[PDB]
Amino acid sequence: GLGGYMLGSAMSRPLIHFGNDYEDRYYRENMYRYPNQVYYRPVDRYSNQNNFVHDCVNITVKQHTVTTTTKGENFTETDIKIMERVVEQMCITQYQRESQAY
Amino acid sequence: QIQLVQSGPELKKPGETVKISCKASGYTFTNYGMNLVKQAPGKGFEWMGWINTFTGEPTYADDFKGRFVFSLDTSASTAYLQINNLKNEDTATYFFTRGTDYWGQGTTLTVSSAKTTAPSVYPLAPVCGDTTGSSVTLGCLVKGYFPEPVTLTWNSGSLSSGVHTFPAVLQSDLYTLSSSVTVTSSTWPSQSITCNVAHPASSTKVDKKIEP
Amino acid sequence: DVVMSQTPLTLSVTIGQPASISCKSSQSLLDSDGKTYLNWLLQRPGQSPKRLIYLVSRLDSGVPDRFTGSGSGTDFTLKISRVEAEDLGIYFCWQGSHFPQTFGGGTKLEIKRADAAPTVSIFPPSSEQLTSGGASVVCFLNNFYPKDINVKWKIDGSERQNGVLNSWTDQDSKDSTYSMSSTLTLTKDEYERHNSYTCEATHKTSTSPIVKSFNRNEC
């Protein structure tokens, strides 16, 4: 499940741009409902940045939805959409951090 | 079609165990966490704890961190609530919930050194009202059974409209239940009305034809 | 342990009228991650609860602006601007901010509907039952309204209370009525020692009790 998975330090959510004022106005009005930190495996256990980031996303997002819906949530197709993106930027930023430390 | 179906009713003796199950279907099982809820007779909802359907790690509230086990079977989208060393206090109806929005039909568990008792089903036919309203009301009486619950229907389900099944009542140590059904005076004894009843605990299941 | 104090215990609302339920927690429901996990669910008669509002005021898909949740810190409120038929049932809040999650005690919501006299019908013990020396005389009072109803039994004139069990059904999702069931049970010996059995009902719809009796002599 999360064996070998670390929780990275918190970081400011990436400001992603979705052209239309609305869907963009959605992220700003819904980001408190999104993560601001990521789960990951030691950066060394991966051959490149893509493998790492890809694993980090599925793990972060999923973990996030199961632990929040447990308290009371509802992630729509958009919520999931705007999340994959956000979390992906964060995972990449996490990759720099980890790699930068090796 | 997001549904959660739980295992059938249970009757256990003190000190025995039970493993109630629930099957999800309609959504990605491991994207939502599951909660467990208790409901003693007449009482309100009591949160037992939850399950991280992703990690599989369960979390018990203070009162259930003693004899309760929460587990999964990811492949089958099935969660299990096992209660060990049963106690009379365990008697209640347990629920599984997908997050905080969907529940299972519930599961009634009964714990007592009392032995099962099938219910005696008696039909019930008119005598008074006939055609001063044109309607006719037939009934059915299930009494002296234990434990809860008993399942009843009319004509194996086909007849569901205009039926009234009243909540069971407690006698010495037996529950009695009743149920009415109303139809047009014509359709009876025109059509055949039969009362279907099953008392899981007693592996019993009976039907009663109603006649004048 | 957070305590949810939901009020009122009951509500009788005329279709088209508002309705507001209150749920106070003994401690702030502002979880650590910044959200306030307060949930409003509805449990219709016979059904399993179903969530309408989560996170204080977010409507679950398919739920009308009619319903709105609000408050914060410790005071929450489920508001129904215009109530209607489909709305009847039990409402309750659930908090998931603190370990352990806790629910409010519930608020049965009744939707007023035109008055209706209870349809009464009595039933003499069945054959198969007397064979064993037991006599149960059932009496059904179906589809009435208001819910308040009183039932009395009279064996050959005298009032009888021993050996009587009653049962009530919740308000109906279809016709908004209530139904009752009274069962007079006694020994076969005593049964046969009496002649006419009566089932008297006292409801708002009639200034006189709605009777229904049968004489054992099938006469």
Side-chain angles (χ1 to χ4, degrees), chain B residues 152-184:
Chain B
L152 173 154
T153 51
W154 289 99
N155 302 321
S156 292
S158 47
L159 185 53
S160 59
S161 183
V163 165
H164 271 133
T165 286
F166 301 81
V169 185
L170 234 174
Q171 303 186 181
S172 62
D173 310 71
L174 313 175
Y175 296 85
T176 290
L177 176 132
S178 138
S179 186
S180 92
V181 56
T182 301
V183 305
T184 308

mmCIF file of all heavy atoms in Angstrom, chain B residues 152-184:
data_model
loop_
_atom_site.group_PDB
_atom_site.id
_atom_site.type_symbol
_atom_site.label_atom_id
_atom_site.label_comp_id
_atom_site.label_asym_id
_atom_site.label_seq_id
_atom_site.Cartn_x
_atom_site.Cartn_y
_atom_site.Cartn_z
ATOM 1 N N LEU B 152 -40.848 -11.315 5.114
ATOM 2 C CA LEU B 152 -42.184 -11.603 4.605
ATOM 3 C C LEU B 152 -42.563 -10.856 3.324
ATOM 4 O O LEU B 152 -42.157 -9.714 3.089
ATOM 5 C CB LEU B 152 -43.227 -11.335 5.702
ATOM 6 C CG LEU B 152 -44.703 -11.416 5.301
ATOM 7 C CD1 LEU B 152 -45.538 -11.763 6.521
ATOM 8 C CD2 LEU B 152 -45.155 -10.094 4.658
ATOM 9 N N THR B 153 -43.363 -11.524 2.501
ATOM 10 C CA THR B 153 -43.814 -10.973 1.234
ATOM 11 C C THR B 153 -45.168 -11.563 0.860
ATOM 12 O O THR B 153 -45.645 -12.510 1.491
ATOM 13 C CB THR B 153 -42.815 -11.301 0.104
ATOM 14 O OG1 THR B 153 -42.543 -12.708 0.107
ATOM 15 C CG2 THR B 153 -41.516 -10.539 0.299
ATOM 16 N N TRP B 154 -45.789 -10.991 -0.166
ATOM 17 C CA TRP B 154 -47.075 -11.472 -0.635
ATOM 18 C C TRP B 154 -46.895 -11.970 -2.060
ATOM 19 O O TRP B 154 -46.444 -11.223 -2.931
ATOM 20 C CB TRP B 154 -48.125 -10.357 -0.587
ATOM 21 C CG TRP B 154 -48.529 -9.983 0.808
ATOM 22 C CD1 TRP B 154 -48.076 -8.921 1.543
ATOM 23 C CD2 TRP B 154 -49.432 -10.704 1.656
ATOM 24 N NE1 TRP B 154 -48.641 -8.939 2.801
ATOM 25 C CE2 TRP B 154 -49.475 -10.022 2.896
ATOM 26 C CE3 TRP B 154 -50.209 -11.862 1.490
ATOM 27 C CZ2 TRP B 154 -50.264 -10.461 3.965
ATOM 28 C CZ3 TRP B 154 -50.994 -12.302 2.554
ATOM 29 C CH2 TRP B 154 -51.015 -11.599 3.779
ATOM 30 N N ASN B 155 -47.238 -13.236 -2.287
ATOM 31 C CA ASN B 155 -47.115 -13.850 -3.607
ATOM 32 C C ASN B 155 -45.687 -13.685 -4.129
ATOM 33 O O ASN B 155 -45.464 -13.197 -5.238
ATOM 34 C CB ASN B 155 -48.111 -13.218 -4.587
ATOM 35 C CG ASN B 155 -49.561 -13.351 -4.126
ATOM 36 O OD1 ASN B 155 -49.961 -14.381 -3.576
ATOM 37 N ND2 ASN B 155 -50.357 -12.310 -4.368
ATOM 38 N N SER B 156 -44.735 -14.093 -3.297
ATOM 39 C CA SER B 156 -43.309 -14.021 -3.593
ATOM 40 C C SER B 156 -42.843 -12.675 -4.147
ATOM 41 O O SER B 156 -41.930 -12.616 -4.974
ATOM 42 C CB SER B 156 -42.913 -15.153 -4.547
ATOM 43 O OG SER B 156 -43.022 -16.417 -3.911
ATOM 44 N N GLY B 157 -43.468 -11.594 -3.688
ATOM 45 C CA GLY B 157 -43.073 -10.269 -4.135
ATOM 46 C C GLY B 157 -43.962 -9.598 -5.164
ATOM 47 O O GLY B 157 -44.066 -8.375 -5.189
ATOM 48 N N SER B 158 -44.596 -10.382 -6.022
ATOM 49 C CA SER B 158 -45.464 -9.832 -7.055
ATOM 50 C C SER B 158 -46.468 -8.814 -6.509
ATOM 51 O O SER B 158 -46.800 -7.835 -7.181
ATOM 52 C CB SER B 158 -46.203 -10.969 -7.749
ATOM 53 O OG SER B 158 -46.741 -11.853 -6.782
ATOM 54 N N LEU B 159 -46.951 -9.050 -5.290
ATOM 55 C CA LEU B 159 -47.918 -8.157 -4.649
ATOM 56 C C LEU B 159 -47.206 -7.301 -3.607
ATOM 57 O O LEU B 159 -46.965 -7.742 -2.482
ATOM 58 C CB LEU B 159 -49.024 -8.985 -3.983
ATOM 59 C CG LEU B 159 -50.218 -8.274 -3.347
ATOM 60 C CD1 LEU B 159 -50.863 -7.302 -4.342
ATOM 61 C CD2 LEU B 159 -51.204 -9.325 -2.892
ATOM 62 N N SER B 160 -46.874 -6.071 -3.985
ATOM 63 C CA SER B 160 -46.160 -5.168 -3.089
ATOM 64 C C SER B 160 -46.918 -3.881 -2.819
ATOM 65 O O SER B 160 -46.660 -3.193 -1.831
ATOM 66 C CB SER B 160 -44.801 -4.825 -3.691
ATOM 67 O OG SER B 160 -44.971 -4.207 -4.953
ATOM 68 N N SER B 161 -47.840 -3.547 -3.711
ATOM 69 C CA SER B 161 -48.632 -2.341 -3.554
ATOM 70 C C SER B 161 -49.801 -2.561 -2.590
ATOM 71 O O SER B 161 -50.436 -3.624 -2.596
ATOM 72 C CB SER B 161 -49.167 -1.883 -4.905
ATOM 73 O OG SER B 161 -49.883 -0.671 -4.762
ATOM 74 N N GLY B 162 -50.067 -1.547 -1.760
ATOM 75 C CA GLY B 162 -51.158 -1.623 -0.805
ATOM 76 C C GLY B 162 -50.957 -2.644 0.294
ATOM 77 O O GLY B 162 -51.922 -3.224 0.771
ATOM 78 N N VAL B 163 -49.706 -2.870 0.690
ATOM 79 C CA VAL B 163 -49.363 -3.819 1.754
ATOM 80 C C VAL B 163 -48.784 -3.090 2.962
ATOM 81 O O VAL B 163 -48.086 -2.091 2.806
ATOM 82 C CB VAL B 163 -48.307 -4.842 1.277
ATOM 83 C CG1 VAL B 163 -47.705 -5.576 2.474
ATOM 84 C CG2 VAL B 163 -48.949 -5.833 0.319
ATOM 85 N N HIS B 164 -49.065 -3.594 4.161
ATOM 86 C CA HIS B 164 -48.556 -2.978 5.383
ATOM 87 C C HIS B 164 -47.941 -3.958 6.352
ATOM 88 O O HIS B 164 -48.652 -4.742 6.985
ATOM 89 C CB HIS B 164 -49.667 -2.222 6.103
ATOM 90 C CG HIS B 164 -49.801 -0.802 5.663
ATOM 91 N ND1 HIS B 164 -51.017 -0.235 5.344
ATOM 92 C CD2 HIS B 164 -48.867 0.152 5.450
ATOM 93 C CE1 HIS B 164 -50.824 1.007 4.946
ATOM 94 N NE2 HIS B 164 -49.530 1.267 5.000
ATOM 95 N N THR B 165 -46.617 -3.904 6.477
ATOM 96 C CA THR B 165 -45.909 -4.790 7.392
ATOM 97 C C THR B 165 -45.495 -4.027 8.642
ATOM 98 O O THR B 165 -44.608 -3.165 8.607
ATOM 99 C CB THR B 165 -44.675 -5.419 6.707
ATOM 100 O OG1 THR B 165 -45.117 -6.421 5.786
ATOM 101 C CG2 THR B 165 -43.743 -6.058 7.727
ATOM 102 N N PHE B 166 -46.149 -4.350 9.750
ATOM 103 C CA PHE B 166 -45.872 -3.681 11.009
ATOM 104 C C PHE B 166 -44.669 -4.245 11.728
ATOM 105 O O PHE B 166 -44.399 -5.439 11.664
ATOM 106 C CB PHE B 166 -47.104 -3.735 11.913
ATOM 107 C CG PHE B 166 -48.315 -3.081 11.305
ATOM 108 C CD1 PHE B 166 -49.097 -3.763 10.375
ATOM 109 C CD2 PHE B 166 -48.625 -1.753 11.602
ATOM 110 C CE1 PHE B 166 -50.167 -3.129 9.746
ATOM 111 C CE2 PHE B 166 -49.692 -1.108 10.979
ATOM 112 C CZ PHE B 166 -50.466 -1.795 10.048
ATOM 113 N N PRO B 167 -43.912 -3.371 12.405
ATOM 114 C CA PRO B 167 -42.711 -3.720 13.165
ATOM 115 C C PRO B 167 -42.972 -4.804 14.202
ATOM 116 O O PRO B 167 -44.008 -4.821 14.849
ATOM 117 C CB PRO B 167 -42.314 -2.391 13.799
ATOM 118 C CG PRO B 167 -42.712 -1.409 12.759
ATOM 119 C CD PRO B 167 -44.080 -1.908 12.344
ATOM 120 N N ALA B 168 -42.019 -5.709 14.348
ATOM 121 C CA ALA B 168 -42.138 -6.798 15.295
ATOM 122 C C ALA B 168 -42.256 -6.283 16.728
ATOM 123 O O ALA B 168 -41.764 -5.203 17.058
ATOM 124 C CB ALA B 168 -40.932 -7.719 15.167
ATOM 125 N N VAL B 169 -42.914 -7.069 17.573
ATOM 126 C CA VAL B 169 -43.088 -6.707 18.972
ATOM 127 C C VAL B 169 -42.510 -7.817 19.846
ATOM 128 O O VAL B 169 -42.454 -8.974 19.431
ATOM 129 C CB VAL B 169 -44.571 -6.507 19.314
ATOM 130 C CG1 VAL B 169 -44.706 -6.005 20.737
ATOM 131 C CG2 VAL B 169 -45.197 -5.528 18.337
ATOM 132 N N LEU B 170 -42.085 -7.464 21.053
ATOM 133 C CA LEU B 170 -41.486 -8.443 21.957
ATOM 134 C C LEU B 170 -42.422 -9.035 23.004
ATOM 135 O O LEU B 170 -43.118 -8.315 23.714
ATOM 136 C CB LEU B 170 -40.276 -7.822 22.652
ATOM 137 C CG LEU B 170 -38.969 -8.602 22.516
ATOM 138 C CD1 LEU B 170 -37.822 -7.808 23.121
ATOM 139 C CD2 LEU B 170 -39.118 -9.955 23.192
ATOM 140 N N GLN B 171 -42.442 -10.362 23.074
ATOM 141 C CA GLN B 171 -43.252 -11.084 24.046
ATOM 142 C C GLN B 171 -42.260 -11.550 25.099
ATOM 143 O O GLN B 171 -41.181 -10.974 25.232
ATOM 144 C CB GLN B 171 -43.898 -12.318 23.422
ATOM 145 C CG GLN B 171 -44.764 -12.064 22.215
ATOM 146 C CD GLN B 171 -45.463 -13.325 21.754
ATOM 147 O OE1 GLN B 171 -46.199 -13.314 20.772
ATOM 148 N NE2 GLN B 171 -45.237 -14.423 22.467
ATOM 149 N N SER B 172 -42.611 -12.602 25.830
ATOM 150 C CA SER B 172 -41.719 -13.141 26.853
ATOM 151 C C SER B 172 -40.289 -13.011 26.344
ATOM 152 O O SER B 172 -39.477 -12.258 26.888
ATOM 153 C CB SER B 172 -42.033 -14.619 27.102
ATOM 154 O OG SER B 172 -41.826 -15.393 25.928
ATOM 155 N N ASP B 173 -40.005 -13.749 25.280
ATOM 156 C CA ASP B 173 -38.696 -13.749 24.664
ATOM 157 C C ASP B 173 -38.917 -14.169 23.227
ATOM 158 O O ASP B 173 -38.081 -14.837 22.632
ATOM 159 C CB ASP B 173 -37.770 -14.745 25.364
ATOM 160 C CG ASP B 173 -37.759 -14.577 26.876
ATOM 161 O OD1 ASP B 173 -38.777 -14.910 27.522
ATOM 162 O OD2 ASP B 173 -36.734 -14.108 27.421
ATOM 163 N N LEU B 174 -40.067 -13.797 22.679
ATOM 164 C CA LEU B 174 -40.386 -14.118 21.292
ATOM 165 C C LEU B 174 -40.971 -12.884 20.620
ATOM 166 O O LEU B 174 -41.675 -12.101 21.251
ATOM 167 C CB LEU B 174 -41.396 -15.261 21.220
ATOM 168 C CG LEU B 174 -41.108 -16.481 22.096
ATOM 169 C CD1 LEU B 174 -42.275 -17.451 21.977
ATOM 170 C CD2 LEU B 174 -39.789 -17.131 21.676
ATOM 171 N N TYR B 175 -40.668 -12.709 19.341
ATOM 172 C CA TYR B 175 -41.174 -11.567 18.600
ATOM 173 C C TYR B 175 -42.354 -11.998 17.749
ATOM 174 O O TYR B 175 -42.375 -13.103 17.204
ATOM 175 C CB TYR B 175 -40.095 -10.990 17.681
ATOM 176 C CG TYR B 175 -38.880 -10.422 18.382
ATOM 177 C CD1 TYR B 175 -37.819 -11.248 18.744
ATOM 178 C CD2 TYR B 175 -38.771 -9.054 18.646
ATOM 179 C CE1 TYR B 175 -36.673 -10.733 19.347
ATOM 180 C CE2 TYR B 175 -37.624 -8.524 19.249
ATOM 181 C CZ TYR B 175 -36.577 -9.375 19.595
ATOM 182 O OH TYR B 175 -35.424 -8.887 20.169
ATOM 183 N N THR B 176 -43.343 -11.120 17.656
ATOM 184 C CA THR B 176 -44.522 -11.364 16.850
ATOM 185 C C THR B 176 -44.614 -10.212 15.879
ATOM 186 O O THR B 176 -44.363 -9.059 16.234
ATOM 187 C CB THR B 176 -45.790 -11.397 17.688
ATOM 188 O OG1 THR B 176 -45.788 -12.581 18.487
ATOM 189 C CG2 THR B 176 -47.026 -11.379 16.795
ATOM 190 N N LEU B 177 -44.974 -10.536 14.650
ATOM 191 C CA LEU B 177 -45.088 -9.551 13.602
ATOM 192 C C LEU B 177 -46.405 -9.777 12.894
ATOM 193 O O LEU B 177 -46.982 -10.859 12.963
ATOM 194 C CB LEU B 177 -43.914 -9.708 12.631
ATOM 195 C CG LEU B 177 -43.861 -8.843 11.372
ATOM 196 C CD1 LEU B 177 -42.478 -8.221 11.241
ATOM 197 C CD2 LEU B 177 -44.199 -9.695 10.157
ATOM 198 N N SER B 178 -46.881 -8.740 12.224
ATOM 199 C CA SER B 178 -48.136 -8.798 11.501
ATOM 200 C C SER B 178 -47.990 -8.075 10.165
ATOM 201 O O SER B 178 -47.037 -7.323 9.963
ATOM 202 C CB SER B 178 -49.224 -8.142 12.340
ATOM 203 O OG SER B 178 -50.048 -7.331 11.527
ATOM 204 N N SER B 179 -48.923 -8.311 9.248
ATOM 205 C CA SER B 179 -48.886 -7.658 7.943
ATOM 206 C C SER B 179 -50.244 -7.732 7.270
ATOM 207 O O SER B 179 -50.896 -8.778 7.279
ATOM 208 C CB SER B 179 -47.838 -8.306 7.035
ATOM 209 O OG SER B 179 -47.700 -7.577 5.821
ATOM 210 N N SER B 180 -50.666 -6.614 6.687
ATOM 211 C CA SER B 180 -51.951 -6.545 6.005
ATOM 212 C C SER B 180 -51.745 -6.286 4.518
ATOM 213 O O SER B 180 -50.667 -5.874 4.087
ATOM 214 C CB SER B 180 -52.806 -5.418 6.598
ATOM 215 O OG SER B 180 -52.616 -4.190 5.903
ATOM 216 N N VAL B 181 -52.788 -6.541 3.739
ATOM 217 C CA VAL B 181 -52.767 -6.317 2.297
ATOM 218 C C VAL B 181 -54.211 -6.086 1.889
ATOM 219 O O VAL B 181 -55.102 -6.811 2.328
ATOM 220 C CB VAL B 181 -52.158 -7.534 1.514
ATOM 221 C CG1 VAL B 181 -52.909 -8.815 1.831
ATOM 222 C CG2 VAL B 181 -52.187 -7.258 0.018
ATOM 223 N N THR B 182 -54.444 -5.059 1.077
ATOM 224 C CA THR B 182 -55.791 -4.722 0.627
ATOM 225 C C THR B 182 -55.912 -4.810 -0.886
ATOM 226 O O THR B 182 -55.020 -4.379 -1.614
ATOM 227 C CB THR B 182 -56.177 -3.297 1.059
ATOM 228 O OG1 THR B 182 -56.122 -3.202 2.485
ATOM 229 C CG2 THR B 182 -57.581 -2.957 0.585
ATOM 230 N N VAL B 183 -57.022 -5.365 -1.356
ATOM 231 C CA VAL B 183 -57.254 -5.502 -2.786
ATOM 232 C C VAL B 183 -58.733 -5.260 -3.079
ATOM 233 O O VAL B 183 -59.519 -5.041 -2.153
ATOM 234 C CB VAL B 183 -56.847 -6.912 -3.277
ATOM 235 C CG1 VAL B 183 -55.410 -7.198 -2.892
ATOM 236 C CG2 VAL B 183 -57.741 -7.967 -2.667
ATOM 237 N N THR B 184 -59.110 -5.287 -4.356
ATOM 238 C CA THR B 184 -60.504 -5.079 -4.740
ATOM 239 C C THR B 184 -61.306 -6.338 -4.428
ATOM 240 O O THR B 184 -60.883 -7.444 -4.766
ATOM 241 C CB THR B 184 -60.632 -4.783 -6.236
ATOM 242 O OG1 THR B 184 -59.748 -3.715 -6.580
ATOM 243 C CG2 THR B 184 -62.066 -4.377 -6.576
#
